[PDB]
Amino acid sequence: FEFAVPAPSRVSPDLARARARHLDWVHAMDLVYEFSCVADIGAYGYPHATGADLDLCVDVLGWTFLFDDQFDRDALAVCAELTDLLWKGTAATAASPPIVVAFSDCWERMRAGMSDAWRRRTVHEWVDYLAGWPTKLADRAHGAVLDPAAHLRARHRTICCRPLFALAERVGGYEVPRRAWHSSRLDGMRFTTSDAVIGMNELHSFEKDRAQGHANLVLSLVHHGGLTGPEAVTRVCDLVQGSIESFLRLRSGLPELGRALGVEGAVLDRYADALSAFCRGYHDWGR
Amino acid sequence: EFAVPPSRVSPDLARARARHLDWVHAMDLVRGEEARRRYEFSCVADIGAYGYPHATGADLDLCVDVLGWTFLFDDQFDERDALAVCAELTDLLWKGTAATAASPPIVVAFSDCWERMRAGMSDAWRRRTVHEWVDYLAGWPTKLADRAHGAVLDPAAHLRARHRTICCRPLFALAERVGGYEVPRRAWHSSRLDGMRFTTSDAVIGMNELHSFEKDRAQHANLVLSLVHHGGLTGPEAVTRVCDLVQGSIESFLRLRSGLPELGRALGVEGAVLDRYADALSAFCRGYHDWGR
Incomplete structure (x- = not known):
């Protein structure tokens, strides 16, 4: 499939070095994979990052998969x-086990140079991501088929998009002002971007999950909605396209948001660009 | 009137009400004959006896204190x-x-409640309850930012923000604390029980939005106003939409409840504690409905 994500296709030019370094890092951390190409996502989602900044992006994303x-x-x-x-x-x-040591290694780099306010809201987002995994184990032990709405609520935690949006600030060199970051306007852009990434992820892993008995949004639509296979796929496609369209409507209101809250418009467009770039990056890598 | 799955009130409300009025005075939250009279006329304290109809004594006191604190x-x-x-x-x-x-009085008062609320509960329960309290706090910077922004939120965005500020999930944890049990970990995190918490929250929000309609319009965001502005609906049409949300939430809650016996068998969980937890969620929704009228 191919969606009209509002961002040009880009990849970081420092991908070769970062990938090689990262494989030594997971080895040094006693975590291990290299053949899955999951590491490269960091260079697609943050196409302007280089050097140590790119290394942090690749490290964090690789950690989530491990x-x-x-x-x-x-x-x-x-x-x-x-x-x-x-x-x-x-x-x-x-x-501490190796998976904890590796995360602390990332968090010390990720929090460096950031304000207490940024650390406060990013900590909460990290912990909300962790809250989704006890649900994963409970649902797997239960064995029941989640309904579409319940599947999406749980996936909005485990997809880990909000911690990675905070990472875009860290490597970009800025912090969205507090009064603007918490607004429903910017939170809606984080939510719509997450929906799109989830929709893409559900379509990529469909065949694998169906053959292995794993959960999938498409299967939940068939089971609870009475839809056929082809119908459920079109339904997920409509979710991605609608999320992109909703994201674009929200972005068009940023100039007025800046005027109302007295926030420089430049940083708002830079943040919107980062969300769009991440969605485009995951789209291209998945394809 | 909605078909919430019986109307009950705690029999120890008289003593609890009098104690609570002295408590808000001692905590420096409501001082003065005028402020005390206005506070006593709102009856917001009494919700603790409606939402937890089986609580008595010190347990009821904790319920009344916490609910009064959220309004303050x-x-x-x-x-x-x-x-x-x-x-x-x-x-x-x-x-x-x-x-x-x-610390300001509002912080002293919360710590006073939290020390009682956390007593006798496991580290696991405290960890998931702390996260829910903090997620409730996370919704208030959003409220102030939206007010300064001045834009009308779309219905879906209003509900996402209200699921934080409504403060239902911390009060569901309180039902465990005063009920005398902890839902086992493997069952509490399941999507079935989380869906029952979500559907119960939707119903309470829907009822709350209709109660505070005039207040929010005279000052703020409201689900009905968002439906009119973004959906093109009229007032009467948007209200019918909110009523359908409450009725649909209850119906979904009831479908999930009928699957609790199978949840217990699959996870090897005592059925009694699951049905008692479902009763507490249902009782809270019923309590707020009756109190609102």
Whole structure:
């Protein structure tokens, strides 16, 4: 499939070095993959990042995929240790498992140079992402087919888009002002971008999940909506296109948002560009 | 009137009401004969006895205190001081601290409630309840930003923000605390029980939006106003839409409830605790409905 994401196709020119470094990093962290090409996503989602900034993007994205593998009692203990690490400002110890040590390695770089306000809202977003994995284990043990709305609510946590939007600020060199970042206008752009990425992800892994018995949005629409296979696919496609259209309507109101809140328009367009670039990056990599 | 799945009220409400009025006085939240009279006329305290009809004594006192606190917390936003309170409460919850001598009365009062609310509960329960309290706090910077922005939110965006400020999920945790049980971990995180929490929240929001319609219009965002502005509907049409949301939420809640026996078998969970949890969610929705009238 191909959608009209409002951003040109781009890739970072420093992808060769970053990929090679990252494979040494997962080895040094005792985490391991290289053949899945999941590492390259960092260079597609942040096409202007180079050097250490790109390394952080590749490290964080690679970690999420390896964190997901932990679920495919020990994983629940990691969720609790990571939560306390973030809430209480701790760092990994000598008894921490490799997945926790690796995350602390990322978080120390990610939080450096950022304000307390930015750290506060990013910590909350990291913990809300962690909250979705106990749900994954419970639903798998239950064995029931989630209804479409319940599948999307759970996936909005595990997709990990909001922590990665905060990362765009960190590597871009700016912070969206507080009064503007919390507005429903910008939160709607984060939500619509997440819907699009989820829709794309559900269409890419459809055949694999159906053959392995895993959950998928398309299968939930067939089971609960009475739709056929072809109908459920078109339904998910409409979600991606509608989310893109909704994102574009929200963006057209940023000049008035800046005037109302007294915020420089430049930073607002830079933030909107980052969200669009991430969605486009995931689209191209997935294809 | 909606078909919420019986009307009940706690029999110890008389004593609880009198104690609570002294409590808000001691916490320095409501002082003065005039402010106390206006507060006593709103009956917002009594909700604790409607939402938890089986609570008595100290348990009921905690329910009345917490619910009264949320309304008093809401009043301060109707700016820079309010954002500082949200940050202090967040650190208090994340870092396990307690109020100091420089903390404002609204912070001292919350710590007073939280110490009682967390007593006797496991670390796992405290961890997921802390996150829900902080997600509730996260909705108030959005409220102030939207008011300064001045734009009319679309219906879906209004509901996402209200699911934070309505404060239903922290109050569902409170039902466990006063009920004397913790839903086992493997069942509490399931999408089935999370869907029952979500559908119950939708119903409470829908009822709340119709109660505060005139107040929000005379001052703020409201679900009915968003439906008129973005959907092109008229007032009467938008209201029928909100009623359909409440009725549909209850119907979905009832379909999920009938699957709790199978959830218990699959996960090996005692059915009694699951049905008791479902009763608490249903009772809270019924309580707010009856109190609103």
